[PDB]
Write a protein that binds this ligand. Structure first.
Ligand SMILES: CC(C)C[C@H]1C(=O)N2CCC[C@H]2[C@]2(O)O[C@](NC(=O)[C@@H]3C=C4c5cccc6[nH]c(Br)c(c56)C[C@H]4N(C)C3)(C(C)C)C(=O)N12
Lengths: 339, 227, 59, 232, 278
């Protein structure tokens, strides 16, 4: 039967891929990086505490002016914050309080959010009316919306629980490209600086490098033992760092098609909710269910430091494009800005 | 006198205005009762919604005696529960709707499975979840008007071969209720309210009010040290 | 048939993914390390900035 | 987006009037507002600022104790109660919307104005000239001076440029020296520091030609420049 | 004559309360699930008990060792004032706690509302401390009617009138409130139509904690005002030997309250083991 023939051939292809990856394992990062000086100790201090949410904070995204924050909570409120003074810019009531994602457009004109409504709501912050209106509702998913990022002001990228990612044209509300091929729930996206390639992590113990222009998967990365919750890109676009429930962070190379670095510690048994990089790529940050955020040295796989100002599970993190602060959310309704 | 410029004083006034409005919205939301509505497909969730005068999550607001309930019907979602249920940690109650006829009728595409067995597996998966250890469960068993005939024709041994009782409403119902409750391994800390209803029972709302009132009293009594 | 519809796309995607001109891990790691070093002096989380530049401490 | 002022006309000295600003097309209660006095022979003068809520109300030194602002958010309206009017108070009055936050657009919309003919430290800014001839198609540079530096330690400047077309209410042209208002084509710009600022204009169109005014938002009370008229 | 140095061992009581009453503050400040109205009132209670034990108790201990006490004329007024102020604070906080429980069961949509509960607890705590200070103030200077050679109150009118505000009013309030609570709980259970595995708990436990709070409060403090109020309006002679006994009996309550309000709450039992690094 061709049913087994095809799957047997697929197994042969998986073996060929494994062998092609092993053929390139002529070295490891943990051998080269032993000769470079250590990152040292990173003692970070709380600089700002942002209060005003009354419920769990699920998502954050920094703008590209490095000053504004978007903070979404399940209290049906999405807040645009001025990070330099703790002043609040904008309070936005939502049509559905069950929000899990948020985004600030790179230009600041538009804000995305959504969650357990299968609709991604896009709000327009700069109107002649002066109020904050719903500019577009993006419907079409059959599952929950897990992460939303902007590609440009006219193009939005979504991830959903129906085992797919999508590229929406914000002016029409219709899908133009749909990225299928996942078997588990898709939890979080990261967008390359080059706008041309995006990475999708899923609750299948897998991550994919998707070409956004053609609508096809370019590279399937494996290695995780459990569901992946968070992904980010290396500043150069050639590597991404992922985090999962297995208390491990992993760095993957988009050019070698291999797992490249494993970040783990004997004292870490809690799942990971969010991962981000500093501008220089030397520091890998991750928020853990153990009520803190750890800062890892990407090169040596040591623990450079900890941030322990939260009383509950740490949710999404954000790092400004300038490197001039790390913003940490939590389920205790406070945001903290660490520099 | 405060080192701040005019526009920043104005923005701070805006911030305080927004903070007051958010606090008012919080005060209103905290006087609302949140209920998580779960159950198997074709369990009659629409029948409870209609009787109580109540894609994605279906949120409905229903008020009784000036107290407000927000019922969240999630049965239309298709995703792994362990990832999205964390947003429901702070509810006061979970309503679980089950059809009794499920004992001798198939819901799943697998004819071997008894949809009452899958419903009680779901009930165990919820009741003993690490997010609902102090969140009470209100269980509604529907379609008793249709159930007497199944009892006359189909003893429960199809679903529970170790039923030794007679083919009557009361004994079979007691056995089923007990089998559902016995999946709760936290008997000392979490209560289960069970009500038998039918198409003509409008008392469902009064029952929900009574059970929610008991939930709030139990939680307040355990907080103040009388429990 | 009903099952082939997925095997065909799994096999086609694997055919797409096998034929990549991969490079050596040592090279990618060297380039990644070089990038981290070249911009190492630009990272305020790695090279602390005096208070005179940090907008979060000037109060 | 409409602002309708009313309640003007001829008043005898010593009397009082109630002017009314009717707001439509925006979230009035979310905005602060200004009333601005314009004397046909003198130009723009700031009168008063009402907060979006019940916050501090600022008045010009020349009207404090005589004029009051009443605000009715549920109706999106403003009222000016003018007591003890003097012949110096004869003027056109403008209702102006504003909002103050990071990236906000203060002073970005002015009403049509209502005329109130009446019978019979601080910081000063100056205009380089009250009038200058211009040639269509060529660029123009309009400079503006202040008695105090407009650059605050926070890095922002508070110099506003306004354009008043004949027969029309003035429009907001530039925010904080370099930020263009929505709807303005990429022909206008400005720069400067301290007490010397310049408005740079590319090739002139007939739709541009009017009187340009400086406004300083550093501190209340607010002031205006003399105003430079372009003659085509 | 030679000092009664055997009395100095009463430091034991001083240690018992500091064990009972210093760890409670700590447990409230360390945990997350302990952030509700009655635990802050219990914190105020433990603090008042600490001030009794450490600012008042040593001076009555020294007195039991001796007859005359002379350190200063003003100092004994500070000692007496702190005694009265802090014991009044303890009783009035017990009243406030019973009020909060009545709120919890009689008005069970307001409890655990953080937007008003902060204000309700601030109000009750401020009222308690201010009323205690106000009642104690008259003793600050020149109302003790005591000479420089003794430290015993000789002003029967101030005390017989203060005994109504610090004891009998909060006594009636606590008694009536706990009676209403028992009525509510018993009427509800006698209508719950449940089987067994929970009514067992809330019947014996809710009843007995209600009985204990009245019991040990009343047993500990009631003797004092009974002997005091009866002695004065009635031409009867009360020997000094028992007054010492019921004053210390009243102080026993300070050690008891922090455990009967702590060690019956599963939240506090767990908090204690982590605090002690068991
Ligand atoms: C009641 C008085 C008149 C008895 C007198 C006395 O005769 N004593 C002889 C031996 C012990 C000593 C005495 O009891 O010890 C003294 N202390 C007291 O009597 C203290 C007075 C108290 C009191 C007075 C008025 C209203 C009150 N509300 C509340 Br709550 C209390 C209280 C607390 C209570 N404390 C626990 C004891 C010492 C200062 C010496 C005292 O004055 N005592």
């Amino acid at each position: 039967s061709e049913l087994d023939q095809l799957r047997q051939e697929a197994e042969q292809l998986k073996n060929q891929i494994r062998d092609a990856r092993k053929a390139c394992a002529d070295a490891t990062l943990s051998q080269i990086t032993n000769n470079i000086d250590p990152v040292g100790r990173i003692q970070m201090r709380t600089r700002r505490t942002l209060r005003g949410h009354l419920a769990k904070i699920y998502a954050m995204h920094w703008g590209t002016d490095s000053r504004l924050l978007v903070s979404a909570s399940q209290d049906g409120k999405l807040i645009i914050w001025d990070s330099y003074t703790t002043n609040k810019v904008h309070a936005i009531p939502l049509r559905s309080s069950w929000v899990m994602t948020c985004a600030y457009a790179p230009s600041g004109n538009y804000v995305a959010c959504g969650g357990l409504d299968n609709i991604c709501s896009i709000y327009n912050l700069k109107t002649r009316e002066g109020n904050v209106r719903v500019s577009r509702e993006l419907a079409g998913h059959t599952g929950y919306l897990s992460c939303c990022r902007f590609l440009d002001d006219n193009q939005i990228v979504t991830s959903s629980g129906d085992t797919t990612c999508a590229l929406w044209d914000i002016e029409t509300g219709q899908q133009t490209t749909t990225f299928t091929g996942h078997t588990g729930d898709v939890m979080s996206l990261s967008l390359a600086p080059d706008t041309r390639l995006f990475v999708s992590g899923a609750c299948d113990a897998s991550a994919k490098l998707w070409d956004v222009r053609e609508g096809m998967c370019r590279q399937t990365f494996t290695g995780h033992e459990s569901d992946i919750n968070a992904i980010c890109f290396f500043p150069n676009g050639n590597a991404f760092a992922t985090g999962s429930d297995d208390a491990t962070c992993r760095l993957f190379d988009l050019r070698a098609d291999q797992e490249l670095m494993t970040y783990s510690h004997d004292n870490i048994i809690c799942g990971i909710t969010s991962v981000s990089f500093s501008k220089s790529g030397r520091l890998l940050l991750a928020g853990y269910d153990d009520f803190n955020c750890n800062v890892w040295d990407a090169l040596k796989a040591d623990r450079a430091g900890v941030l322990a100002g939260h009383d509950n599970r740490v949710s999404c993190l954000g790092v400004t494009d300038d490197g001039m602060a790390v913003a940490t959310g939590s389920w205790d309704s406070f945001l903290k800005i660490w520099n | 006198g405060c080192t701040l410029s005019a526009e920043d004083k104005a923005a701070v006034e805006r911030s305080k205005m927004i903070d007051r409005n958010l606090r008012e919205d919080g005060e209103k939301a905290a006087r609302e009762v949140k209920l998580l509505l779960l159950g198997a497909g074709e369990s009659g969730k629409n029948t409870i919604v209609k009787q109580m005068k109540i894609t994605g999550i279906v949120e409905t607001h229903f008020t009784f005696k000036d107290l407000h309930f927000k019922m969240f019907d999630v049965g239309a979602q298709r995703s792994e529960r362990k990832k999205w249920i964390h947003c429901f940690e702070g509810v006061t109650a979970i309503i679980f709707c089950v059809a009794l006829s499920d004992y001798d009728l198939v819901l799943a595409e697998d004819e071997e499975m008894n949809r009452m067995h899958a419903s009680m597996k779901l009930f165990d998966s919820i009741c003993n979840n690490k997010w609902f250890t102090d969140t009470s469960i209100i269980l509604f068993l529907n379609k008793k008007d249709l159930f007497e005939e199944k009892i006359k024709k189909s003893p429960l041994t199809i679903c529970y071969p170790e039923y030794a009782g007679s083919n009557t409403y009361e004994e079979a119902a007691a056995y089923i209720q007990c089998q559902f409750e016995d999946l709760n391994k936290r008997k000392d800390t979490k209560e289960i309210y069970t009500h038998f209803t039918c198409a003509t029972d409008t008392k469902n709302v009064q029952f929900v009010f009574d059970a929610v009132t008991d939930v709030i009293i139990k939680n307040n009594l355990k907080d103040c040290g009388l429990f | 048939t009903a099952s082939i519809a997925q095997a065909r796309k799994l096999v086609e995607q694997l055919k797409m993914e096998a034929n990549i001109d991969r490079i050596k891990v040592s090279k990618a790691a060297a380039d990644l390390m070089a990038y981290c070093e070249a911009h190492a002096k630009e990272d305020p989380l790695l090279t602390p900035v005096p208070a005179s530049e940090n907008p979060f401490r000037e109060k | 987006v409409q602002l309708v002022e009313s309640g003007g006309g001829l008043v005898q000295p010593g009397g009082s009037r109630k002017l009314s600003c009717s707001a439509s097309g925006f979230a009035f209660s979310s905005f602060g507002m200004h009333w601005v006095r314009q004397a046909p022979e003198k130009g723009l003068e700031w009168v008063a600022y009402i907060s979006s809520g019940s916050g501090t109300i600022y008045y010009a030194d020349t009207v404090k104790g005589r004029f009051t602002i009443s605000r009715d958010d549920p109706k999106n309206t403003l009222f000016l109660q003018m007591t003890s009017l003097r012949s110096e108070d004869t003027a056109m009055y403008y209702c102006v919307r504003s909002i103050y936050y990071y990236g906000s657009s203060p002073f970005d919309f002015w009403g049509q104005g209502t005329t109130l003919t009446v019978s019979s430290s601080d910081i000063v800014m100056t205009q380089a000239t009250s009038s200058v001839p211009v040639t269509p198609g060529e660029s123009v540079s309009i400079s503006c001076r202040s008695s105090k530096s407009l650059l605050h330690s926070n890095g922002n400047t508070y110099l506003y440029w306004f354009l008043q077309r004949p027969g029309q209410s003035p429009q907001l042209l530039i925010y904080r020296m370099s930020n263009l208002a929505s709807g303005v084509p990429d022909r206008f710009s400005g720069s400067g520091s301290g007490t010397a600022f310049t408005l740079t204009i590319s090739r002139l169109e007939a739709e541009d030609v009017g009187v340009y005014y400086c406004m300083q938002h550093l501190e209340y009370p607010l002031t205006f420049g003399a105003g430079t008229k372009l003659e085509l | 004559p030679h000092y009664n140095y055997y009395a100095t061992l009463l430091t034991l009581l001083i240690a018992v309360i500091v064990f009972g009453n210093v760890l409670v503050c700590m447990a409230v400040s360390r945990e997350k699930a302990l952030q509700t109205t009655t635990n802050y009132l219990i914190v105020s209670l433990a603090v008042a008990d600490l001030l009794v034990a450490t600012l008042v108790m040593p001076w009555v201990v020294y007195l039991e060792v001796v007859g005359e006490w002379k350190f200063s004329r003003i100092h004994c007024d500070i000692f007496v004032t702190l005694d009265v102020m802090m014991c009044t604070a303890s009783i009035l906080n017990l009243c406030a706690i019973s009020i909060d429980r009545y709120t919890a069961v009689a008005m069970p949509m307001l409890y655990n509302t953080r937007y008003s509960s902060k204000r309700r607890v601030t109000v009750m705590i401020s009222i308690v401390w201010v009323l205690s200070f106000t009642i104690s103030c008259p003793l600050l200077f020149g109302l003790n009617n005591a000479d420089q050679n003794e430290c015993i109150i000789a002003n029967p009118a101030f005390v017989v009138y203060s005994s109504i505000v610090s004891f009998y009013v909060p006594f009636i309030v606590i008694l009536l409130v706990y009676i209403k609570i028992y009525i509510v709980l018993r009427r509800r259970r006698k209508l719950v139509n449940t089987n067994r595995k929970l009514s067992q708990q809330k019947e014996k436990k809710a009843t007995q904690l209600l009985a204990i709070y009245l019991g040990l409060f009343i047993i500990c403090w009631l003797p004092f005002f009974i002997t005091h109020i009866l002695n004065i309006h009635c031409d009867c002679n009360i020997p000094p030997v028992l007054y010492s006994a019921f004053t210390w009996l009243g102080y026993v309550n300070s050690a008891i309250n922090p455990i009967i309000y702590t060690t019956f709450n599963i939240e506090f039992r767990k908090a204690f083991l982590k605090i002690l690094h068991c």
